[PDB]
Amino acid sequence: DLGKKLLEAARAGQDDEVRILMANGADVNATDASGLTPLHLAATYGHLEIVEVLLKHGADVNAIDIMGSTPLHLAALIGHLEIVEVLLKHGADVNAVDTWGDTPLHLAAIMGHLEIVEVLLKHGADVNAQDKFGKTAFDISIDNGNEDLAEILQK
Amino acid sequence: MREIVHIQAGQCGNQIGAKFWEVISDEHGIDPTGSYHGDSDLQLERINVYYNEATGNKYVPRAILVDLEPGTMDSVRSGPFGQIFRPDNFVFGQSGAGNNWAKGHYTEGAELVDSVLDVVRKESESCDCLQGFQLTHSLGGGTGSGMGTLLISKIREEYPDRIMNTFSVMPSPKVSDTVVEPYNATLSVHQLVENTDETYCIDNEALYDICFRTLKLTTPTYGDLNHLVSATMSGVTTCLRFPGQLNADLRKLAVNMVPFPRLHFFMPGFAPLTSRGSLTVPELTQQMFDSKNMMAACDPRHGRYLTVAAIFRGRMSMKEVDEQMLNVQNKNSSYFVEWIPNNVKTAVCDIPPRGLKMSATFIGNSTAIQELFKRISEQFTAMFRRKAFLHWYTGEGMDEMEFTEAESNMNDLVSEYQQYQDATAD
Amino acid sequence: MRECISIHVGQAGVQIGNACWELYCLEHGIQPDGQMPSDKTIGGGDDSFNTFFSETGAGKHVPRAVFVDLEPTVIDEVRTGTYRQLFHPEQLITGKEDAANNYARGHYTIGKEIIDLVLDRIRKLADQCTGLQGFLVFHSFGGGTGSGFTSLLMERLSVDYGKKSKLEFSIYPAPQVSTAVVEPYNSILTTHTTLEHSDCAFMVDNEAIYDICRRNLDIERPTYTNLNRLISQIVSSITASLRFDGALNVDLTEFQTNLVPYPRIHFPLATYAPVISAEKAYHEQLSVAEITNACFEPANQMVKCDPRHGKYMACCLLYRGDVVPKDVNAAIATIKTKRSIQFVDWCPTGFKVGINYQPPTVVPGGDLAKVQRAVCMLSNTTAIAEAWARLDHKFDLMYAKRAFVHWYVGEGMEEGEFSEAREDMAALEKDYEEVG
Ligand SMILES: Nc1nc2c(ncn2[C@@H]2O[C@H](COP(=O)(O)OP(=O)(O)OP(=O)(O)O)[C@@H](O)[C@H]2O)c(=O)[nH]1
Ligand SMILES: Nc1nc2c(ncn2[C@@H]2O[C@H](COP(=O)(O)OP(=O)(O)OP(=O)(O)O)[C@@H](O)[C@H]2O)c(=O)[nH]1
Ligand SMILES: CCc1cc(/N=N\c2ccc(C)c(O)c2)cc(CC)c1OC
Ligand SMILES: [Ca+2]
Ligand SMILES: [Mg+2]
Ligand SMILES: [Mg+2]
């Protein structure tokens, strides 16, 4: 079953092996036990070329794992700016909500990825989106005294 | 209470550790070769606290230098006082920890820890009355964090009746945007709560904000940050190194600063804040308590002071000091827990640091430090909830439950701070 | 003659002891090397000052004194100072590690390492005595050594010298000069454990001495040296009866007889007058009536409290200098016609009077003007309970939250000893309220 192999190749950044497996019919939208797809794993580990190739061959840019995490959630969490932009250009839901009530903006804010915060805002990120405890991205900035982030969020 | 054995682990620990030795050497008249070259006998009365006196009237730091990465070595020796260190006290591995706490604590670090303790034994046996240990390290990396806390554990086991003191540098996205640092820091704080008596929280978030916003340095370097760290380190050790009205030592500081064993994380401050190349007693006093002057990114006015120690350096009216310190306590009496009477102590040293004629150093046990642990906990939780990069740790033998225990212990620490923030005498 | 041994414990005890023995030597005509010309009996004797000084055969007069500290810095200055040749070298005893402001370290762990050496050195002095009367113990309340090691020492002295009297000079803490936040703990801990073993304890409130130095001596920021020289003048006035001839408080037992009606309430209040700045050497010389009246002004008290809110159970007036007895009696008659002076209904309402006709001595380098007549009043008043109450309250604030208690539990002490000591203080305060 080439699904597991494509999931591992995407996580490991083996570009050439990703192309081969999709030539032999590998499921581009295969899921691991937790519901993560090749695109999830490539976006987590910063493999831009694999992100782009997957999106050009039928990957669901807005696929969700069992916790509601989309590839954009993870790229915004880990801080892969170009992957964030590629995912958005291919139709990523900028305001996707996971089981914790978090949007990509929440995660980039928590992790201090300020450039990604700006990109998400330019693409319509909801500054009023609340997590399960009622906090918006701005509340997180105010609560942790991140003046740089709070300035960006008030643009 | 005389000798302090200094340990510096990892890149950050050895970096700020080297600047520490450069600063106190200058303050004490020790030149890069180990010879004394000063003009005051006060520089020498308590020199034995940090220096071993060798044959030739040469003073040698009681300093042990540790890193799993050889690269940091050549950097220290090529430094100004790099040759002052005992060559035998360099204990350096071949493969770094790769910013992996697990490699530092369990695999790479465990292989080298025995070699490090061999050197700690030697130094310790050469002491008349060992006070304890002082470790410099970061919590966001793998060596200073993982192996540093491993070393603390082993040393507490061999020297259980000695004070363990740390200068722990907390990570911040503003300086190193590596997302596993909250993992490494939470796993370490878990270790520091149990195995250290006193920890100075040096927050890279605060250091960046000071340089960027206050000193207007558009792109702070590690040198800029470390300029503030070396100043803080010199201030908080002033009374160990210079003889004053008080025979201050590490245990007397712990006994009077730590009312509850786990709440031993101090918020340091310093005034005036200056850049690497560039004031009245009341100004010194207000700036010392100012949140802008804190080396931890927390507002003291959002919590309550359990205990506070202040150190004034320079030629100045001791009575003016006494009257300013009393003033700051009565006007802002709500920020000092009423159930610890007379919880602010002041010391004045005549010798000021380099480049300044008057300075003040602040050491607070404030409940506001929970803002720092909350910031780390929130980043830890954001990463951990998505299980990002966990095989890097379990691939070295850790259990997933080791992460939940650390997070649970850190959140308990936060709750303990909040409990005493809201407590009343009534 | 009957010998008295002085014991100084911890920094405050040692430094005040230096000041006192400096004063003693001047008062008796003894040089820093022990030589005393006015002594015609060389090699020994039975003079009154032999209570405090042994005598070698080479003319050397040696204090019957022991200095003990758990760290050496302070005592090292005695060993290298003006009086490095005065004391028995073996009676300057130092450890290498102090008690870290922790009563439990001074008493249980650190203190146990040196207690037996201290006792063996004390027995050495006691063995040179023909009739030891007891001990004078100097120490702070707030220090870990002054509190914890003193309590351990007093416990061992009671067992090893059951028949001998023990007097205390204890330095009561003041936030102005305080060193540690846990000093209320240490103060209550040592008081509880020392109460049964001490016969009479003269507390010295550092705040009261601080205020006298500022107001009377015009010293802006008093140092320990300023405080200690003023304290030594008061100690000297209290111990003068033991070192000179006289009819009042001639031995340690009489201190209890005259000042301590019951064993537990043995904390007399000392008041001293006149305290005049040495920069005013041409002051009006105060009369007996004037200096006697000043002993009832709270400003001249050695412990901050209001004797007008209390009752007297004993009153002893100790005069020095040009003091004619009839003028004392007239001055006392006046006092007895003051309704702010209320005695308990079961004690002799009179006053006990001693006069040493030698004018008081002032130390070179001191801040006190020389005066022709001075007085120290020793009274046992229930108002001293106010000082215990201040300490009890600071103790209660911290102990309610168990703040700092782990430092004591970790050094060989049970948590229950806190509540046991506090309850003992509760009983002491009711003892005072019942007499009041
Ligand atoms: N203030 C300050 N922080 C530093 C310095 N060097 C590294 N850091 C911080 O330390 C953290 C990374 O830990 P390091 O000390 O570099 O890593 P290590 O302890 O050597 O262990 P390895 O990652 O395996 O090399 C990050 O938060 C950095 O921002 C420094 O010189 N000054
Ligand atoms: N009057 C007076 N008080 C002193 C002096 N030295 C210290 N004190 C007071 O004593 C208390 C501290 O106790 P210390 O005697 O210094 O401590 P210690 O007995 O040496 O015990 P350690 O904790 O081991 O240092 C504080 O209240 C000080 O203000 C002194 O020379 N004169
Ligand atoms: C070198 C370590 C050190 C030790 C001290 N010892 N005792 C202290 C401390 C705090 C307080 C609240 C107290 O009451 C006593 C005091 C200071 C400065 C006053 C000090 O310098 C940081
Ligand atoms: Ca004789
Ligand atoms: Mg490194
Ligand atoms: Mg001491």
CSV table of C-alpha atoms in Angstrom, one decimal, chain B residues 91-392:
chain,number,residue,atom,x,y,z
B,91,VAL,CA,34.7,19.2,29.0
B,92,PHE,CA,33.4,19.2,25.5
B,93,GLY,CA,31.8,16.4,23.4
B,94,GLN,CA,31.8,15.9,19.6
B,95,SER,CA,28.2,16.0,18.5
B,96,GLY,CA,25.9,18.8,19.7
B,97,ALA,CA,22.4,18.1,21.1
B,98,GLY,CA,20.7,19.6,18.0
B,99,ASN,CA,18.4,21.7,20.2
B,100,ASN,CA,17.0,18.4,21.5
B,101,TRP,CA,16.5,18.3,25.3
B,102,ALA,CA,16.3,14.5,25.1
B,103,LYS,CA,19.7,14.2,23.5
B,104,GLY,CA,21.1,16.5,26.2
B,105,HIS,CA,19.4,14.8,29.2
B,106,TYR,CA,19.4,11.1,28.2
B,107,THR,CA,21.8,10.2,25.4
B,108,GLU,CA,24.6,12.6,24.3
B,109,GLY,CA,24.7,14.3,27.6
B,110,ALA,CA,24.6,11.2,29.8
B,111,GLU,CA,27.7,9.9,28.0
B,112,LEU,CA,29.6,13.1,28.9
B,113,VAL,CA,28.1,13.9,32.3
B,114,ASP,CA,30.5,11.6,34.2
B,115,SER,CA,33.5,13.4,32.7
B,116,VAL,CA,32.0,16.7,33.9
B,117,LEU,CA,31.4,15.5,37.5
B,118,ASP,CA,35.0,14.3,37.7
B,119,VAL,CA,36.0,17.9,37.2
B,120,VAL,CA,33.4,19.2,39.7
B,121,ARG,CA,34.8,16.8,42.3
B,122,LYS,CA,38.3,18.1,41.8
B,123,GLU,CA,37.3,21.8,42.1
B,124,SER,CA,35.0,21.1,45.1
B,125,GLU,CA,37.8,19.2,47.1
B,126,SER,CA,40.0,22.3,46.7
B,127,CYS,CA,37.6,24.5,48.7
B,128,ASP,CA,37.9,25.5,52.3
B,129,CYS,CA,34.1,26.0,52.8
B,130,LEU,CA,32.1,25.4,49.6
B,131,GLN,CA,29.0,27.6,49.4
B,132,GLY,CA,27.5,25.9,46.4
B,133,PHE,CA,27.2,26.0,42.7
B,134,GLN,CA,26.2,28.6,40.1
B,135,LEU,CA,25.2,27.4,36.6
B,136,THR,CA,24.7,29.6,33.5
B,137,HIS,CA,22.7,28.0,30.7
B,138,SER,CA,19.7,28.5,28.4
B,139,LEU,CA,16.5,26.5,28.6
B,140,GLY,CA,15.5,26.6,24.9
B,141,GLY,CA,18.4,24.6,23.6
B,142,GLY,CA,19.5,21.0,24.1
B,143,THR,CA,22.8,21.1,26.0
B,144,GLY,CA,22.3,23.9,28.4
B,145,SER,CA,18.7,22.7,29.0
B,146,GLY,CA,18.9,18.9,28.8
B,147,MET,CA,22.4,18.3,30.0
B,148,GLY,CA,22.4,21.3,32.3
B,149,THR,CA,19.4,20.0,34.3
B,150,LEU,CA,21.0,16.5,34.2
B,151,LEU,CA,24.1,18.0,35.8
B,152,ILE,CA,22.0,19.8,38.4
B,153,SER,CA,20.4,16.5,39.3
B,154,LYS,CA,23.7,14.6,39.7
B,155,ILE,CA,25.3,17.5,41.6
B,156,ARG,CA,22.4,17.8,44.0
B,157,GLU,CA,22.9,14.1,44.6
B,158,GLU,CA,26.6,14.4,45.5
B,159,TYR,CA,26.4,17.7,47.3
B,160,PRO,CA,22.9,17.7,48.9
B,161,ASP,CA,23.7,20.3,51.6
B,162,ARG,CA,25.1,22.9,49.1
B,163,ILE,CA,23.2,25.8,47.5
B,164,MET,CA,22.3,25.3,43.8
B,165,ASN,CA,22.0,28.6,41.9
B,166,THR,CA,21.2,29.1,38.3
B,167,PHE,CA,21.1,31.9,35.7
B,168,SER,CA,18.5,30.4,33.3
B,169,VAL,CA,17.9,32.1,29.9
B,170,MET,CA,14.3,31.7,28.8
B,171,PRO,CA,13.6,31.4,25.0
B,172,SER,CA,11.5,33.9,23.0
B,173,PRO,CA,10.3,33.9,19.4
B,174,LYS,CA,11.8,37.4,19.1
B,175,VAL,CA,15.3,36.1,19.3
B,176,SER,CA,15.4,32.4,18.2
B,177,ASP,CA,12.3,31.4,16.2
B,178,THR,CA,12.8,27.7,16.7
B,179,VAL,CA,9.5,26.1,17.7
B,180,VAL,CA,10.8,23.3,19.9
B,181,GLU,CA,12.2,25.7,22.4
B,182,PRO,CA,9.0,25.7,24.6
B,183,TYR,CA,9.4,21.9,24.8
B,184,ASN,CA,13.0,22.2,26.0
B,185,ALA,CA,12.1,25.0,28.4
B,186,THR,CA,9.1,23.3,30.0
B,187,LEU,CA,11.0,20.1,30.4
B,188,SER,CA,13.8,22.1,32.2
B,189,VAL,CA,11.6,24.3,34.4
B,190,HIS,CA,10.2,21.0,35.6
B,191,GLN,CA,13.8,20.1,36.7
B,192,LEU,CA,14.6,23.6,38.2
B,193,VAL,CA,11.5,23.6,40.4
B,194,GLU,CA,12.7,20.4,42.2
B,195,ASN,CA,16.5,20.7,42.2
B,196,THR,CA,17.5,24.4,42.5
B,197,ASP,CA,17.4,26.7,45.5
B,198,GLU,CA,17.5,30.0,43.6
B,199,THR,CA,17.1,30.7,39.8
B,200,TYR,CA,17.5,34.1,38.1
B,201,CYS,CA,15.0,34.3,35.3
B,202,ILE,CA,16.8,36.0,32.4
B,203,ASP,CA,14.1,36.4,29.7
B,204,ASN,CA,15.3,36.8,26.1
B,205,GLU,CA,11.9,38.4,25.4
B,206,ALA,CA,12.6,41.1,28.0
B,207,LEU,CA,16.2,41.5,26.8
B,208,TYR,CA,15.1,42.0,23.2
B,209,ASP,CA,12.3,44.4,24.2
B,210,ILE,CA,14.8,46.5,26.2
B,211,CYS,CA,17.3,46.7,23.3
B,212,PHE,CA,14.7,47.2,20.6
B,213,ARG,CA,12.2,49.6,22.3
B,214,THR,CA,14.1,51.3,25.1
B,215,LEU,CA,17.7,51.4,23.7
B,216,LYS,CA,16.3,51.9,20.1
B,217,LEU,CA,18.6,49.2,18.7
B,218,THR,CA,16.9,48.3,15.5
B,219,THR,CA,18.4,44.8,15.3
B,220,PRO,CA,19.7,43.5,18.6
B,221,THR,CA,22.5,41.0,18.6
B,222,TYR,CA,23.4,38.4,21.2
B,223,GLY,CA,26.2,40.9,22.2
B,224,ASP,CA,23.5,43.5,22.9
B,225,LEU,CA,21.4,41.1,24.9
B,226,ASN,CA,24.5,39.7,26.8
B,227,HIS,CA,25.6,43.3,27.7
B,228,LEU,CA,22.5,43.5,29.8
B,229,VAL,CA,22.9,39.9,31.1
B,230,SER,CA,26.5,40.6,32.2
B,231,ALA,CA,25.4,43.8,34.0
B,232,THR,CA,22.6,41.9,35.8
B,233,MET,CA,25.0,39.0,36.7
B,234,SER,CA,27.6,41.5,38.2
B,235,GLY,CA,24.9,43.3,40.2
B,236,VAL,CA,23.3,40.2,41.8
B,237,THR,CA,26.7,38.8,42.8
B,238,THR,CA,28.1,42.1,44.1
B,239,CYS,CA,27.6,41.2,47.8
B,240,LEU,CA,29.3,37.8,47.3
B,241,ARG,CA,32.4,39.4,45.8
B,242,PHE,CA,32.8,42.7,47.7
B,243,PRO,CA,32.9,42.9,51.5
B,244,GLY,CA,30.1,45.0,53.0
B,245,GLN,CA,28.2,45.5,56.2
B,246,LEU,CA,26.8,42.1,55.3
B,247,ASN,CA,28.6,38.8,55.0
B,248,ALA,CA,26.2,37.8,52.3
B,249,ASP,CA,26.2,34.3,50.9
B,250,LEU,CA,24.0,32.1,48.7
B,251,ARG,CA,22.2,30.4,51.7
B,252,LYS,CA,21.4,33.7,53.5
B,253,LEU,CA,19.9,35.0,50.2
B,254,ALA,CA,17.8,31.8,49.8
B,255,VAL,CA,16.6,31.8,53.4
B,256,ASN,CA,15.3,35.4,53.2
B,257,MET,CA,14.1,35.4,49.5
B,258,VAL,CA,12.4,32.0,49.2
B,259,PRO,CA,9.3,31.7,51.5
B,260,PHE,CA,8.1,28.5,49.8
B,261,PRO,CA,10.5,25.9,48.3
B,262,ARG,CA,9.2,25.9,44.7
B,263,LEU,CA,8.9,29.7,44.4
B,264,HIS,CA,12.6,30.4,43.9
B,265,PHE,CA,12.5,32.1,40.5
B,266,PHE,CA,13.7,35.6,40.8
B,267,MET,CA,12.9,38.6,38.5
B,268,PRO,CA,16.1,40.7,38.2
B,269,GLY,CA,16.3,44.3,37.2
B,270,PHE,CA,18.9,46.9,36.7
B,271,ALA,CA,19.2,50.7,36.4
B,272,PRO,CA,20.3,52.6,34.3
B,273,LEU,CA,19.8,50.6,31.1
B,274,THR,CA,22.7,51.4,28.6
B,275,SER,CA,23.9,50.3,25.2
B,276,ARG,CA,27.5,48.8,24.9
B,277,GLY,CA,28.9,52.4,24.3
B,278,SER,CA,27.2,55.5,25.8
B,279,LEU,CA,21.6,59.7,37.8
B,280,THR,CA,20.0,60.5,41.2
B,281,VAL,CA,19.1,58.1,44.0
B,282,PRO,CA,15.3,58.6,43.5
B,283,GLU,CA,15.7,58.1,39.8
B,284,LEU,CA,17.7,54.9,40.5
B,285,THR,CA,15.0,53.7,42.8
B,286,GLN,CA,12.0,54.3,40.5
B,287,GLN,CA,13.8,52.8,37.5
B,288,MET,CA,14.8,49.8,39.5
B,289,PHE,CA,11.2,48.8,40.1
B,290,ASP,CA,10.0,49.9,36.6
B,291,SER,CA,8.7,47.1,34.4
B,292,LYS,CA,10.8,48.6,31.6
B,293,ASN,CA,13.9,47.7,33.7
B,294,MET,CA,13.0,44.1,34.4
B,295,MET,CA,15.0,41.3,32.9
B,296,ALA,CA,11.9,39.1,32.8
B,297,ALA,CA,9.1,40.0,30.5
B,298,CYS,CA,6.5,40.4,33.3
B,299,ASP,CA,4.9,43.4,34.8
B,300,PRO,CA,5.5,43.5,38.6
B,301,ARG,CA,2.4,45.7,39.0
B,302,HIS,CA,0.3,42.7,37.8
B,303,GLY,CA,1.5,40.7,40.9
B,304,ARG,CA,2.7,41.1,44.4
B,305,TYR,CA,6.2,41.2,45.8
B,306,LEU,CA,6.9,38.3,48.2
B,307,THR,CA,10.5,39.4,48.9
B,308,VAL,CA,12.9,42.0,47.4
B,309,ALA,CA,16.6,42.6,47.6
B,310,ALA,CA,18.1,45.8,46.3
B,311,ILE,CA,21.8,46.6,45.7
B,312,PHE,CA,23.1,50.2,45.3
B,313,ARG,CA,26.6,50.6,43.9
B,314,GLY,CA,28.6,53.8,43.9
B,315,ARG,CA,29.3,56.8,46.1
B,316,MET,CA,26.0,58.1,47.4
B,317,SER,CA,24.1,59.0,50.6
B,318,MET,CA,23.1,55.8,52.3
B,319,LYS,CA,20.4,57.7,54.1
B,320,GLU,CA,19.0,59.0,50.8
B,321,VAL,CA,18.8,55.4,49.8
B,322,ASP,CA,17.0,54.4,53.0
B,323,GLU,CA,14.4,57.2,52.5
B,324,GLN,CA,13.8,56.4,48.8
B,325,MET,CA,13.4,52.6,49.5
B,326,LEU,CA,10.9,53.4,52.3
B,327,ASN,CA,9.0,55.8,50.0
B,328,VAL,CA,8.6,53.2,47.3
B,329,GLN,CA,7.2,50.8,49.9
B,330,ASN,CA,4.5,53.0,51.4
B,331,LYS,CA,3.2,54.6,48.2
B,332,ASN,CA,3.0,51.2,46.6
B,333,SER,CA,2.3,49.2,49.8
B,334,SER,CA,-0.5,47.2,48.0
B,335,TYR,CA,2.2,45.4,45.8
B,336,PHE,CA,4.1,44.0,48.8
B,337,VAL,CA,2.5,41.0,50.6
B,338,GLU,CA,1.4,42.2,54.0
B,339,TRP,CA,1.9,38.8,55.5
B,340,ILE,CA,5.7,39.1,55.1
B,341,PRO,CA,6.7,42.1,57.2
B,342,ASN,CA,9.8,44.0,56.3
B,343,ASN,CA,10.3,42.0,53.1
B,344,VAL,CA,12.5,44.6,51.3
B,345,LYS,CA,16.2,44.6,52.2
B,346,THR,CA,18.8,47.1,50.9
B,347,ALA,CA,22.6,46.8,50.5
B,348,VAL,CA,25.0,49.5,49.4
B,349,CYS,CA,28.4,48.8,47.9
B,350,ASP,CA,31.0,51.5,47.3
B,351,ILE,CA,32.5,50.0,44.2
B,352,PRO,CA,30.5,50.8,41.0
B,353,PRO,CA,30.7,48.7,37.8
B,354,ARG,CA,32.6,49.7,34.7
B,355,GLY,CA,31.4,52.8,32.9
B,356,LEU,CA,29.0,53.9,35.6
B,357,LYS,CA,29.4,56.0,38.8
B,358,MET,CA,26.1,54.9,40.4
B,359,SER,CA,23.9,51.9,39.7
B,360,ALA,CA,21.1,49.9,41.3
B,361,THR,CA,20.3,46.2,41.0
B,362,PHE,CA,16.9,44.6,41.8
B,363,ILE,CA,16.1,41.1,42.8
B,364,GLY,CA,12.4,40.4,43.3
B,365,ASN,CA,10.4,37.3,44.3
B,366,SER,CA,7.2,38.5,42.7
B,367,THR,CA,4.0,36.6,41.9
B,368,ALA,CA,4.1,38.4,38.5
B,369,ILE,CA,6.7,35.9,37.2
B,370,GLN,CA,3.8,33.7,36.5
B,371,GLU,CA,3.3,35.7,33.3
B,372,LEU,CA,6.6,34.2,32.1
B,373,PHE,CA,5.7,30.6,32.8
B,374,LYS,CA,2.2,31.2,31.3
B,375,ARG,CA,3.8,32.5,28.1
B,376,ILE,CA,5.9,29.3,27.8
B,377,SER,CA,3.0,27.1,28.8
B,378,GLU,CA,0.8,28.5,26.0
B,379,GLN,CA,3.5,27.9,23.4
B,380,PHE,CA,4.3,24.4,24.8
B,381,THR,CA,0.6,23.6,24.7
B,382,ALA,CA,0.1,24.9,21.1
B,383,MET,CA,2.9,22.7,19.9
B,384,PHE,CA,2.1,19.7,22.1
B,385,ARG,CA,-1.6,19.6,21.2
B,386,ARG,CA,-0.6,19.0,17.6
B,387,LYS,CA,2.2,16.6,18.7
B,388,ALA,CA,4.7,18.4,16.5
B,389,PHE,CA,8.2,17.1,16.4
B,390,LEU,CA,7.6,14.6,19.2
B,391,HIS,CA,9.4,11.6,17.6
B,392,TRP,CA,12.6,13.6,17.9
